[PDB]
Design a protein around this ligand. Structure first.
Ligand SMILES: Cc1noc(C)c1-c1cnc2[nH]ccc2c1
Length: 127
């Protein structure tokens, strides 16, 4: 089968900013999740071919992963923190949509999401 192109991480005509909230999303939020023992399945787009999941991109139409988020943050792709927060939430939601309750991958997403919520609870006010 075939994978779709990954989400874009570069777009020169999309307005961009570097804000203190976005810096926090990279330095604290992404870094915290990335190093977690359960991060690995989320560090790159789902390879539906290698995983033999031909229905994945039939069901998931807005794919997202932390590899993409990391690149977006490092390359200042975002205008605001809410855009990036939405990407994280999309990543988690996709996992819950595609998989079954209790599946290992769902337990992994839940652990990462718990940490995500802990960190964004202390998102700094905009400077
Ligand atoms: C399946 C599935 N649904 O969401 C995610 C993330 C996956 C997913 C992604 N990469 C993986 N690598 C090894 C297992 C594995 C599972």
């Amino acid at each position: 089968s075939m994978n779709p192109p990954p989400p874009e991480t570069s777009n020169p005509n999309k307005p961009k900013r570097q804000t203190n909230q976005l810096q926090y999303l990279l330095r604290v939020v992404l870094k915290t999740l990335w190093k977690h023992q359960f991060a690995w399945p989320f560090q790159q787009p789902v390879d539906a071919v290698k995983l033999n999941l031909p229905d994945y991109y039939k069901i998931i139409k807005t794919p997202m992963d932390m590899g993409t988020i990391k690149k977006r943050l490092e390359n200042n792709y975002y205008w605001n923190a809410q855009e990036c927060i939405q990407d994280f939430n999309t990543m988690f939601t996709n996992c819950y949509i595609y998989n079954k309750p209790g599946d290992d991958i769902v337990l992994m997403a839940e652990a990462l999401e718990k940490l995500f919520l802990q960190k964004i609870n202390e998102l700094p006010t905009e400077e």
